[PDB]
Design an enzyme around this catalytic site. Sequence first.
Site, PDB file in Angstrom:
ATOM      1  N   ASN A  41       0.688  -1.259   0.435  1.00 27.37           N
ATOM      2  CA  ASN A  41       0.182  -0.450  -0.121  1.00 27.37           C
ATOM      3  C   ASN A  41       0.961   1.654   0.018  1.00 27.37           C
ATOM      4  O   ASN A  41       0.748   2.342   0.273  1.00 27.37           O
ATOM      5  CB  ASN A  41      -1.157  -0.224   0.674  1.00 27.37           C
ATOM      6  CG  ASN A  41      -0.275   0.043   2.460  1.00 27.37           C
ATOM      7  OD1 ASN A  41       0.754  -0.031   2.318  1.00 27.37           O
ATOM      8  ND2 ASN A  41      -1.155  -0.450   3.411  1.00 27.37           N
ATOM      9  N   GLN A  64      -3.687   4.695  18.189  1.00 28.03           N
ATOM     10  CA  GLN A  64      -4.912   3.992  17.387  1.00 28.03           C
ATOM     11  C   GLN A  64      -6.279   3.227  17.954  1.00 28.03           C
ATOM     12  O   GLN A  64      -5.219   2.179  17.906  1.00 28.03           O
ATOM     13  CB  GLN A  64      -4.049   4.003  16.432  1.00 28.03           C
ATOM     14  CG  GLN A  64      -3.675   4.906  14.953  1.00 28.03           C
ATOM     15  CD  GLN A  64      -3.112   4.720  14.003  1.00 28.03           C
ATOM     16  OE1 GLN A  64      -3.061   6.035  13.105  1.00 28.03           O
ATOM     17  NE2 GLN A  64      -3.212   3.948  13.149  1.00 28.03           N
ATOM     18  N   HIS A  67      -6.757   6.788  10.052  1.00 29.54           N
ATOM     19  CA  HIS A  67      -5.862   6.614   9.196  1.00 29.54           C
ATOM     20  C   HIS A  67      -6.045   5.377   8.195  1.00 29.54           C
ATOM     21  O   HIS A  67      -6.736   4.284   8.618  1.00 29.54           O
ATOM     22  CB  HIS A  67      -4.792   5.866  10.255  1.00 29.54           C
ATOM     23  CG  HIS A  67      -3.714   5.321  10.371  1.00 29.54           C
ATOM     24  ND1 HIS A  67      -2.949   4.424  10.190  1.00 29.54           N
ATOM     25  CD2 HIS A  67      -2.854   5.103   8.308  1.00 29.54           C
ATOM     26  CE1 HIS A  67      -1.658   3.516   9.852  1.00 29.54           C
ATOM     27  NE2 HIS A  67      -2.197   4.146   8.396  1.00 29.54           N
TER      28      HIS A  67
HETATM   29  N1  LIG Z   1      -0.527   5.414   6.622  1.00 31.01           N
HETATM   30  C1  LIG Z   1      -0.473   4.412   5.986  1.00 31.01           C
HETATM   31  O1  LIG Z   1      -0.537   3.817   5.226  1.00 31.01           O
HETATM   32  C2  LIG Z   1       1.031   4.481   6.190  1.00 31.01           C
HETATM   33  C3  LIG Z   1       2.186   4.153   6.799  1.00 31.01           C
HETATM   34  N2  LIG Z   1       3.633   3.823   6.500  1.00 31.01           N
HETATM   35  C4  LIG Z   1       4.443   4.082   7.706  1.00 31.01           C
HETATM   36  O2  LIG Z   1       5.465   4.004   6.524  1.00 31.01           O
HETATM   37  C5  LIG Z   1       6.943   3.882   6.986  1.00 31.01           C
HETATM   38  C6  LIG Z   1       7.479   3.725   5.019  1.00 31.01           C
HETATM   39  O3  LIG Z   1       7.185   2.771   4.925  1.00 31.01           O
HETATM   40  P1  LIG Z   1       8.546   1.937   3.324  1.00 31.01           P
HETATM   41  O4  LIG Z   1       8.417   3.553   2.816  1.00 31.01           O
HETATM   42  O5  LIG Z   1       7.302   0.983   2.357  1.00 31.01           O
HETATM   43  O6  LIG Z   1       9.116   1.344   4.124  1.00 31.01           O
HETATM   44  P2  LIG Z   1      10.936   1.142   3.097  1.00 31.01           P
HETATM   45  O7  LIG Z   1      11.667  -0.042   5.049  1.00 31.01           O
HETATM   46  O8  LIG Z   1      10.941   0.733   2.247  1.00 31.01           O
HETATM   47  O9  LIG Z   1      11.257   2.316   3.437  1.00 31.01           O
HETATM   48  C7  LIG Z   1      11.687   2.821   5.229  1.00 31.01           C
HETATM   49  C8  LIG Z   1      12.814   3.241   4.955  1.00 31.01           C
HETATM   50  O10 LIG Z   1      13.371   4.089   6.111  1.00 31.01           O
HETATM   51  C9  LIG Z   1      14.777   4.399   6.204  1.00 31.01           C
HETATM   52  N3  LIG Z   1      14.680   5.329   7.593  1.00 31.01           N
HETATM   53  C10 LIG Z   1      15.213   3.961   8.844  1.00 31.01           C
HETATM   54  N4  LIG Z   1      15.494   4.420   9.493  1.00 31.01           N
HETATM   55  C11 LIG Z   1      16.019   6.046   9.399  1.00 31.01           C
HETATM   56  C12 LIG Z   1      16.262   6.860  10.894  1.00 31.01           C
HETATM   57  N5  LIG Z   1      16.558   6.891  11.641  1.00 31.01           N
HETATM   58  N6  LIG Z   1      16.156   8.037   9.783  1.00 31.01           N
HETATM   59  C13 LIG Z   1      16.098   8.335   8.831  1.00 31.01           C
HETATM   60  N7  LIG Z   1      15.503   6.777   7.929  1.00 31.01           N
HETATM   61  C14 LIG Z   1      15.289   6.082   8.596  1.00 31.01           C
HETATM   62  C15 LIG Z   1      15.633   3.356   6.125  1.00 31.01           C
HETATM   63  O11 LIG Z   1      16.207   4.267   4.809  1.00 31.01           O
HETATM   64  P3  LIG Z   1      18.066   4.173   5.535  1.00 31.01           P
HETATM   65  O12 LIG Z   1      18.653   2.538   5.757  1.00 31.01           O
HETATM   66  O13 LIG Z   1      18.924   4.705   4.676  1.00 31.01           O
HETATM   67  O14 LIG Z   1      17.715   4.688   6.859  1.00 31.01           O
HETATM   68  C16 LIG Z   1      13.879   3.132   4.816  1.00 31.01           C
HETATM   69  O15 LIG Z   1      14.771   2.837   3.196  1.00 31.01           O
HETATM   70  C17 LIG Z   1       5.923   2.295   7.177  1.00 31.01           C
HETATM   71  O16 LIG Z   1       7.001   1.569   7.884  1.00 31.01           O
HETATM   72  C18 LIG Z   1       5.179   2.658   7.714  1.00 31.01           C
HETATM   73  O17 LIG Z   1       5.466   2.766   9.577  1.00 31.01           O
HETATM   74  C19 LIG Z   1       3.227   2.441   5.490  1.00 31.01           C
HETATM   75  C20 LIG Z   1       2.540   2.758   4.895  1.00 31.01           C
HETATM   76  C21 LIG Z   1       1.241   2.717   4.846  1.00 31.01           C
END
Ligand SMILES: NC(=O)C1=CN([C@@H]2O[C@H](COP(=O)(O)OP(=O)(O)OC[C@H]3O[C@@H](n4cnc5c(N)ncnc54)[C@H](OP(=O)(O)O)[C@@H]3O)[C@@H](O)[C@H]2O)C=CC1
Lengths: 384, 384
Positions: free
Chosen positions: A146, A313, A332
């Site tokens: 999603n 939530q 949400h």
């Molecule tokens: N609103 C909604 O309905 C939804 C919300 N979400 C939220 O979005 C989040 C992200 O999803 P998605 O992009 O698919 O996940 P991914 O795992 O693809 O990407 C998350 C990225 O976060 C980065 N990250 C991790 N730790 C840190 C840090 N301390 N500071 C900065 N960047 C960081 C990582 O890059 P690096 O290793 O370079 O730090 C990683 O690539 C999910 O974990 C979820 O909580 C997701 C889906 C739906």
Amino acid sequence: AKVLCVLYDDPTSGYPPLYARNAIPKIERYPDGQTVPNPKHIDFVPGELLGCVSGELGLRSYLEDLGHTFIVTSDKEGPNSVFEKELPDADIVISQPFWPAYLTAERIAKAKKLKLALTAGIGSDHVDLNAAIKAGITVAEETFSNGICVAEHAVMMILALVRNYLPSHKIAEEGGWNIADCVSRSYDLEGMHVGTVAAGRIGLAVLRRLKPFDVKLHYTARHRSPRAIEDELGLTYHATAEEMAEVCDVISIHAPLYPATEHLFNAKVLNKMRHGSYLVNTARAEICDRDDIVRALESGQLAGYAGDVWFPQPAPANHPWRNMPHNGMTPHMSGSSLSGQARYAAGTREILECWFENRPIRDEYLIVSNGKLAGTGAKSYGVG
Amino acid sequence: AKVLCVLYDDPTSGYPPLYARNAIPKIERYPDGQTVPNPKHIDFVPGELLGCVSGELGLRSYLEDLGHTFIVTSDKEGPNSVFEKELPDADIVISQPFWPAYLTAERIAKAKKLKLALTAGIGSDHVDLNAAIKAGITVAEETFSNGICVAEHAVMMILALVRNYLPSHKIAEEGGWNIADCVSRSYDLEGMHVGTVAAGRIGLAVLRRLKPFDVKLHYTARHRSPRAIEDELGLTYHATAEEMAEVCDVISIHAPLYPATEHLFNAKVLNKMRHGSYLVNTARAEICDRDDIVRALESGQLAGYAGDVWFPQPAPANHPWRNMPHNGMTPHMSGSSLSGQARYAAGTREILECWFENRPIRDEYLIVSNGKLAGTGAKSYGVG
Ligand SMILES: NC(=O)C1=CN([C@@H]2O[C@H](COP(=O)(O)OP(=O)(O)OC[C@H]3O[C@@H](n4cnc5c(N)ncnc54)[C@H](OP(=O)(O)O)[C@@H]3O)[C@@H](O)[C@H]2O)C=CC1
Ligand SMILES: NC(=O)C1=CN([C@@H]2O[C@H](COP(=O)(O)OP(=O)(O)OC[C@H]3O[C@@H](n4cnc5c(N)ncnc54)[C@H](OP(=O)(O)O)[C@@H]3O)[C@@H](O)[C@H]2O)C=CC1
């Protein structure tokens, strides 16, 4: 096996709802090449409402035909909820982030048969991952299912904030015209500095959608993106959120929630921004400090805040983010568009098929496995 | 000379408003290579509110120091309005589309000294162009000045409709959660067929902003766009709006208003769309049939409609587009963002400097000149 599944309540109008349209687009791959879920079958038509109690994620026939039991409830709060009462002998627990069955350390201790904690959606922070690691519970989610939904919602919210959409729509509904009132806080996005926290699956999708708006793009992440991506999009990298905050007009958060990101966007970071900046958070609420956000909007340090995620939530009726000034909140919902549901429901089934058939759950779906962060969990999360 | 200028009322709070920020991005060129306005000077800081009575488009000192008289009013309705009373000896009339001083054939006949009808903004359909041609009046506007503003607004509205943003924000404000209610009508844009009526300055900007959302793009226009453009965006062309309606999930209108486009989107076109389609109109209201839009939403033929343009303007408090089902309306504001105002106010001054100094008004700013459609008017309009 006993599968305990927590879903949100049916629509107020009843179930099924009156659908606006009868089909949705066919999606086969995500932008990075990952395939959409590949369960052997699905027992729904994509576009149906699946994430509520009567929708059942389309799982009942699949599970019962195999001799499993399947309990679906929305009642999830406290030790007297259906959820907590059924938990002690559940082999598998499924819930969605939008209506999350929190798996605290205490609940995990009570869950004597629990071996698989399955997120229907993305983001497994409603599970205590340290406790899951110790208990030998596998934690998995439908990676990318999603994410595009979220990227759309985030860009929509950025535009609504900067352009002053929501108060202006109210003026239209209520009989006014009042152009000066509408535009006194209406700006174009064009030429602004916009940054994402993270350039992962959703963050990159957002950066790509922002590019043709002719903004100046920034990001922060623990690990720099490939030079090819930075060149594609004209990205400026910052080692920390604080540094990025100094130069951005708008920030959108796209990192997971775990200890290192908890309260990342607190007063210290917010106050680095230019007065009148904008913040969008479709990641997780607790990446921001709740009350610091309120103060920033009350002072005008932020001109606007919007997101779909809250804590806890469901958000209580009195939650301060509902009526703080200059907000564009929704409940949400972004990851639970009907289009997204089709994919995460299919992926939930795919994962169950693998589990029951003693085949691997896709590496990219894993968060915790065999007593450690694994797969995507190892790449995106921390437990320190 | 006497310059008669109609502007909208000051903010309810007073003038100046409390600005959320004290600077905006610097824009120097539009995407096709056209330069932003080049007046000798401007007497405002970009970001100020200019389009209301106290804002004066930043023109008063410029005009009065040259010995011209400058009358600014919001009073524009009927023959006793300040506008119509001052009209008979006005050499130049200026107004914005958002609060338009309609130059009917009857008013033009009364305007014995009128030589220049200047739109502050884009779109001169509030002037009777046949009457202007007959009277030998020059009609001009600040081409491209606020087009990017509109493109952003239109994409914002497309997303808000498809994703069900506005009713969901109401649930957040009112204390609910109700995910099923929020998402029962929430879809992703990804993979949908989206078409624009016209691929002009604004239509092309919209198509470019839509591209990374991974939609299938369509357009209709009187002639084919350049090879580079159709290739860049993967466009499918349709000779007519009716033909495009058959294959699009979403249409956004970006053509000018003149007889050929008047009531183009009536029941005949609407009924060609698939049940549950979406329509956005940030062009001009009368390109749609007002009541046909209402009925399409009432029956569900359209799942949603949004725009910022109405007829007449201002729209009366009882105008049926305000509370028809499934709408995302705003008052007419997109072209009057503070960012857009900076550009059209600068262009209004540039045009006046040229006019008073006996130098050409830029060809691209012209709509009518020397008794015929001219410049951009000749390329984009018809007079039926
Ligand atoms: N609103 C909604 O309905 C939804 C919300 N979400 C939220 O979005 C989040 C992200 O999803 P998605 O992009 O698919 O996940 P991914 O795992 O693809 O990407 C998350 C990225 O976060 C980065 N990250 C991790 N730790 C840190 C840090 N301390 N500071 C900065 N960047 C960081 C990582 O890059 P690096 O290793 O370079 O730090 C990683 O690539 C999910 O974990 C979820 O909580 C997701 C889906 C739906
Ligand atoms: N909401 C707001 O605040 C604003 C609204 N607008 C409105 O948007 C309109 C478009 O502005 P902009 O893009 O800058 O103008 P342009 O003149 O750049 O483009 C208009 C396009 O319309 C096409 N067109 C003309 N007649 C027809 C027809 N009969 N059917 C289909 N297409 C047609 C033309 O292409 P072709 O010759 O190939 O047909 C032309 O490229 C303005 O005229 C104005 O009414 C503008 C600014 C702000």
